[PDB]
Amino acid sequence: KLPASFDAREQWPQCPTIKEIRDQGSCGSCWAFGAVEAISDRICIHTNAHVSVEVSAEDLLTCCGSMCGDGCNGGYPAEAWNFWTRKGLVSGGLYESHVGCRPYSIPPCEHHVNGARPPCTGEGDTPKCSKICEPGYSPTYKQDKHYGYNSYSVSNSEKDIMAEIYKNGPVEGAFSVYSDFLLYKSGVYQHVTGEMMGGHAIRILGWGVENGTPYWLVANSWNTDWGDNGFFKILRGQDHCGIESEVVAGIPRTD
Ligand SMILES: *C(=O)N[C@@H](CC1CCCCC1)C(=O)N[C@@H](Cc1ccccc1)C(=O)O
């Protein structure tokens, strides 16, 4: 019996990563962000909050290589979670956090919104794969790796995606972004106007209903001044913009 609403932040309240919004910077690395965010969450869930770490977007973005795609010029979720199963991922927090083994090297920026940071730009290079932790971090790069037991596609089924989240925690998904999506502030996003911009990868962490509209609860990787504090809701139940068609997840190995 699935509940009418579910929010992973409410189910697993000693897992702060689920609460967190990252900033992919001037880099098309959302494929990597949705993966390491959901993986961070699932490690904390899998251990009852005994292990709570920011998994390194840098390590996945820079060290996966051609298996995952083309780094900052785009990649795909399914191979991101496969990489976690094969080579694992070290820890790493936000730009200049000094959190973990490999904190993200690309500065934060303004994503389709006004604020104090520089506006995000295109054409950024993928940073180099560096298999060493920031000076003074313990343990070693190799010792800090977290591995996946498995990786898998979730079927294009609303109730299967809900059950997956409900049992195992947040997932990665991808959908088609039309230009009206860029100006999202609140409520349940449905495509009403604008042309296709491209595919986008995100973290799905729950569901609900607002004013009779069923939705998914989704985290973007565009900082907290984008959207609804960095989150959005998107129409659920109709494979809207492909939101149910590209869902990926995986079960962590106990460290
Ligand atoms: C994942 O990284 N997705 C990127 C492309 C999406 C395609 C559909 C339009 C929305 C974006 C993305 O999120 N890009 C970021 C960062 C960026 C900014 C400017 C130039 C290149 C990359 C974005 O904020 O759009």
PDB file of N, CA and C and ligand atoms in Angstrom, residues 24-31 72 74 109-112 120-124 175-178 181-182 197-201 220-222, ligand 1:
ATOM      1  N   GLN A  24      26.351  22.133 -10.153  1.00  0.00           N
ATOM      2  CA  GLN A  24      27.193  21.512 -11.185  1.00  0.00           C
ATOM      3  C   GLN A  24      28.123  22.540 -11.873  1.00  0.00           C
ATOM      4  N   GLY A  25      27.942  23.825 -11.615  1.00  0.00           N
ATOM      5  CA  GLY A  25      28.782  24.860 -12.237  1.00  0.00           C
ATOM      6  C   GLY A  25      28.603  24.928 -13.750  1.00  0.00           C
ATOM      7  N   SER A  26      29.572  25.532 -14.423  1.00  0.00           N
ATOM      8  CA  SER A  26      29.609  25.741 -15.886  1.00  0.00           C
ATOM      9  C   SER A  26      30.138  24.467 -16.561  1.00  0.00           C
ATOM     10  N   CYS A  27      29.336  23.398 -16.524  1.00  0.00           N
ATOM     11  CA  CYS A  27      29.731  22.028 -16.898  1.00  0.00           C
ATOM     12  C   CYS A  27      28.421  21.255 -17.064  1.00  0.00           C
ATOM     13  N   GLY A  28      28.304  20.486 -18.131  1.00  0.00           N
ATOM     14  CA  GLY A  28      27.106  19.665 -18.396  1.00  0.00           C
ATOM     15  C   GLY A  28      27.154  18.346 -17.667  1.00  0.00           C
ATOM     16  N   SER A  29      27.444  18.376 -16.378  1.00  0.00           N
ATOM     17  CA  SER A  29      27.728  17.172 -15.556  1.00  0.00           C
ATOM     18  C   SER A  29      26.502  16.728 -14.749  1.00  0.00           C
ATOM     19  N   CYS A  30      25.283  17.129 -15.142  1.00  0.00           N
ATOM     20  CA  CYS A  30      24.080  16.737 -14.371  1.00  0.00           C
ATOM     21  C   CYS A  30      24.018  15.201 -14.334  1.00  0.00           C
ATOM     22  N   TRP A  31      24.404  14.510 -15.374  1.00  0.00           N
ATOM     23  CA  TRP A  31      24.372  13.022 -15.413  1.00  0.00           C
ATOM     24  C   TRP A  31      25.111  12.489 -14.174  1.00  0.00           C
ATOM     25  N   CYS A  72      32.031  16.975 -19.093  1.00  0.00           N
ATOM     26  CA  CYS A  72      31.218  18.208 -19.071  1.00  0.00           C
ATOM     27  C   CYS A  72      30.408  18.382 -20.355  1.00  0.00           C
ATOM     28  N   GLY A  74      28.401  16.172 -21.544  1.00  0.00           N
ATOM     29  CA  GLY A  74      27.249  15.266 -21.370  1.00  0.00           C
ATOM     30  C   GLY A  74      27.643  13.813 -21.186  1.00  0.00           C
ATOM     31  N   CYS A 109      27.652  28.924  -9.942  1.00  0.00           N
ATOM     32  CA  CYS A 109      27.295  29.989 -10.892  1.00  0.00           C
ATOM     33  C   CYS A 109      25.801  30.113 -10.901  1.00  0.00           C
ATOM     34  N   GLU A 110      25.294  31.132 -11.588  1.00  0.00           N
ATOM     35  CA  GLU A 110      23.844  31.365 -11.697  1.00  0.00           C
ATOM     36  C   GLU A 110      23.286  30.615 -12.916  1.00  0.00           C
ATOM     37  N   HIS A 111      22.371  29.676 -12.657  1.00  0.00           N
ATOM     38  CA  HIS A 111      21.738  28.802 -13.659  1.00  0.00           C
ATOM     39  C   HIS A 111      20.365  29.351 -14.032  1.00  0.00           C
ATOM     40  N   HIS A 112      20.262  30.138 -15.118  1.00  0.00           N
ATOM     41  CA  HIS A 112      18.950  30.594 -15.656  1.00  0.00           C
ATOM     42  C   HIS A 112      18.233  31.388 -14.571  1.00  0.00           C
ATOM     43  N   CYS A 120      26.419  31.176 -15.310  1.00  0.00           N
ATOM     44  CA  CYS A 120      26.965  29.947 -15.898  1.00  0.00           C
ATOM     45  C   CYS A 120      27.226  30.164 -17.400  1.00  0.00           C
ATOM     46  N   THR A 121      28.375  29.678 -17.865  1.00  0.00           N
ATOM     47  CA  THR A 121      28.800  29.672 -19.288  1.00  0.00           C
ATOM     48  C   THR A 121      29.019  28.234 -19.775  1.00  0.00           C
ATOM     49  N   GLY A 122      29.059  28.093 -21.096  1.00  0.00           N
ATOM     50  CA  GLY A 122      29.252  26.814 -21.792  1.00  0.00           C
ATOM     51  C   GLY A 122      30.706  26.596 -22.137  1.00  0.00           C
ATOM     52  N   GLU A 123      31.025  25.386 -22.612  1.00  0.00           N
ATOM     53  CA  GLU A 123      32.310  25.071 -23.296  1.00  0.00           C
ATOM     54  C   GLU A 123      33.412  24.777 -22.266  1.00  0.00           C
ATOM     55  N   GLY A 124      33.081  24.680 -20.970  1.00  0.00           N
ATOM     56  CA  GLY A 124      34.039  24.265 -19.917  1.00  0.00           C
ATOM     57  C   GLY A 124      34.682  22.901 -20.205  1.00  0.00           C
ATOM     58  N   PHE A 175      14.904  13.789 -18.138  1.00  0.00           N
ATOM     59  CA  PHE A 175      13.690  14.209 -18.864  1.00  0.00           C
ATOM     60  C   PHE A 175      14.111  15.263 -19.882  1.00  0.00           C
ATOM     61  N   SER A 176      13.183  15.549 -20.787  1.00  0.00           N
ATOM     62  CA  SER A 176      13.363  16.556 -21.859  1.00  0.00           C
ATOM     63  C   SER A 176      13.011  17.924 -21.289  1.00  0.00           C
ATOM     64  N   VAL A 177      13.952  18.885 -21.379  1.00  0.00           N
ATOM     65  CA  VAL A 177      13.748  20.259 -20.861  1.00  0.00           C
ATOM     66  C   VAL A 177      13.292  21.120 -22.036  1.00  0.00           C
ATOM     67  N   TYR A 178      12.096  21.658 -21.910  1.00  0.00           N
ATOM     68  CA  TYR A 178      11.574  22.714 -22.823  1.00  0.00           C
ATOM     69  C   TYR A 178      11.844  24.064 -22.166  1.00  0.00           C
ATOM     70  N   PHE A 181      10.602  25.344 -18.708  1.00  0.00           N
ATOM     71  CA  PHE A 181      11.074  24.671 -17.463  1.00  0.00           C
ATOM     72  C   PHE A 181      12.095  25.600 -16.760  1.00  0.00           C
ATOM     73  N   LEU A 182      12.864  26.342 -17.535  1.00  0.00           N
ATOM     74  CA  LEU A 182      14.029  27.123 -17.038  1.00  0.00           C
ATOM     75  C   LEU A 182      13.541  28.153 -16.021  1.00  0.00           C
ATOM     76  N   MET A 197      15.052  22.053 -25.463  1.00  0.00           N
ATOM     77  CA  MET A 197      16.461  22.486 -25.222  1.00  0.00           C
ATOM     78  C   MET A 197      17.410  21.272 -25.202  1.00  0.00           C
ATOM     79  N   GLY A 198      17.013  20.137 -24.621  1.00  0.00           N
ATOM     80  CA  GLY A 198      17.896  18.982 -24.464  1.00  0.00           C
ATOM     81  C   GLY A 198      17.469  18.098 -23.310  1.00  0.00           C
ATOM     82  N   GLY A 199      18.184  16.998 -23.134  1.00  0.00           N
ATOM     83  CA  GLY A 199      17.923  16.065 -22.028  1.00  0.00           C
ATOM     84  C   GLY A 199      18.610  16.523 -20.756  1.00  0.00           C
ATOM     85  N   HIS A 200      18.000  16.231 -19.621  1.00  0.00           N
ATOM     86  CA  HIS A 200      18.543  16.652 -18.317  1.00  0.00           C
ATOM     87  C   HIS A 200      18.370  15.541 -17.296  1.00  0.00           C
ATOM     88  N   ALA A 201      19.402  15.341 -16.489  1.00  0.00           N
ATOM     89  CA  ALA A 201      19.448  14.284 -15.462  1.00  0.00           C
ATOM     90  C   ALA A 201      19.323  14.935 -14.088  1.00  0.00           C
ATOM     91  N   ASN A 220      17.190  19.488  -8.477  1.00  0.00           N
ATOM     92  CA  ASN A 220      18.068  19.956  -9.561  1.00  0.00           C
ATOM     93  C   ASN A 220      19.462  20.161  -8.989  1.00  0.00           C
ATOM     94  N   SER A 221      20.454  20.370  -9.861  1.00  0.00           N
ATOM     95  CA  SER A 221      21.869  20.572  -9.506  1.00  0.00           C
ATOM     96  C   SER A 221      22.290  21.978  -9.969  1.00  0.00           C
ATOM     97  N   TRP A 222      21.400  22.940  -9.767  1.00  0.00           N
ATOM     98  CA  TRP A 222      21.559  24.360 -10.201  1.00  0.00           C
ATOM     99  C   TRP A 222      21.578  25.291  -8.995  1.00  0.00           C
TER     100      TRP A 222
HETATM  101  C1  LIG B   1      23.161  18.517 -17.406  1.00  0.00           C
HETATM  102  O1  LIG B   1      24.282  18.857 -17.142  1.00  0.00           O
HETATM  103  N1  LIG B   1      22.302  19.190 -18.145  1.00  0.00           N
HETATM  104  C2  LIG B   1      22.816  20.398 -18.806  1.00  0.00           C
HETATM  105  C3  LIG B   1      22.042  20.714 -20.066  1.00  0.00           C
HETATM  106  C4  LIG B   1      20.543  20.908 -19.893  1.00  0.00           C
HETATM  107  C5  LIG B   1      19.883  20.758 -21.289  1.00  0.00           C
HETATM  108  C6  LIG B   1      18.510  21.371 -21.366  1.00  0.00           C
HETATM  109  C7  LIG B   1      18.620  22.858 -21.043  1.00  0.00           C
HETATM  110  C8  LIG B   1      18.944  22.931 -19.560  1.00  0.00           C
HETATM  111  C9  LIG B   1      20.328  22.327 -19.331  1.00  0.00           C
HETATM  112  C10 LIG B   1      22.808  21.552 -17.734  1.00  0.00           C
HETATM  113  O2  LIG B   1      22.187  21.452 -16.658  1.00  0.00           O
HETATM  114  N2  LIG B   1      23.559  22.617 -17.988  1.00  0.00           N
HETATM  115  C11 LIG B   1      23.735  23.654 -16.950  1.00  0.00           C
HETATM  116  C12 LIG B   1      25.220  24.181 -16.853  1.00  0.00           C
HETATM  117  C13 LIG B   1      25.665  24.871 -18.119  1.00  0.00           C
HETATM  118  C14 LIG B   1      25.332  26.231 -18.290  1.00  0.00           C
HETATM  119  C15 LIG B   1      25.668  26.917 -19.456  1.00  0.00           C
HETATM  120  C16 LIG B   1      26.318  26.235 -20.469  1.00  0.00           C
HETATM  121  C17 LIG B   1      26.643  24.871 -20.323  1.00  0.00           C
HETATM  122  C18 LIG B   1      26.319  24.168 -19.135  1.00  0.00           C
HETATM  123  C19 LIG B   1      22.743  24.839 -17.100  1.00  0.00           C
HETATM  124  O3  LIG B   1      22.680  25.613 -16.102  1.00  0.00           O
HETATM  125  O4  LIG B   1      22.040  24.879 -18.136  1.00  0.00           O
END
